[PDB]
Symmetry: C2
Subunit: 129 residues, 2 copies
């Protein structure tokens, strides 16, 4: 069904999410690719770019500038729906910009074997409200 924030499920998603953040910080491309859905339907809206399909996304990871090592997360919200779906929303700052970063990822577990993956993500920077 759709129990909201079942504790086991919140814990799985937190684990997967913080593993993605490690991959991000270390620019561990293989680890990022393992956790991001890789199909033509995948969409990623990034800070300065738009990517439709896993192939575009992967090609972009190979050439893009890495996240700043000073990246710091703020006000992370992990919300899960039943056992297989979730959203993780966080803000972020770093020394590389005065702007406020926002990141929202939709996570799904499309089969037990596949485990948790990001099926869509949107990242933006805005002036500190």
């Amino acid at each position: 069904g759709m129990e909201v924030n079942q504790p086991d499920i919140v814990a799985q998603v937190q684990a997967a999410f913080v593993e993605y953040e490690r991959a991000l910080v270390e620019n561990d491309i293989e680890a990022m690719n393992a956790l991001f859905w890789h199909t033509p339907e995948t969409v990623r809206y990034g800070i300065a770019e738009v990517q439709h399909g896993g192939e575009a996304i992967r090609a972009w990871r190979e050439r893009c500038e890495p996240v700043p090592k000073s990246r710091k997360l703020h006000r992370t919200v992990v919300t899960t729906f039943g056992t297989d779906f979730a959203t993780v929303s966080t803000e972020f700052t770093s020394d590389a910009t005065p702007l406020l970063g926002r990141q929202m990822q939709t996570w799904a577990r499309l089969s037990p074997a596949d485990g948790w993956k990001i099926v869509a993500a949107h990242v933006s920077l805005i002036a500190m409200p």
Copy 2:
């Protein structure tokens, strides 16, 4: 059960989504509130603002500037997982700004009686390609 893009489910979410767009364009606040999850867990990252919880989001709708009437969507991707979860990602332009808009919404059907709702949304503007 998370089959991707079951046609009945894609059709349902497209209908709910285009109704939300009508509500946006007409600034029909009641209709928008009907389709947006209203709990403390709800998150919205807007063009110039960050809102945590249904109450902040509703209070913002009452005072914010409405979407430009000339708003036009581009490259809308509706992706459904099983019968109860979806993402809708679109770009948008208008005469009010030279910037390209991106909007990603996570949708869930939390119960049959509740129907489809936006449980998380992220909207941003960036320079055109």
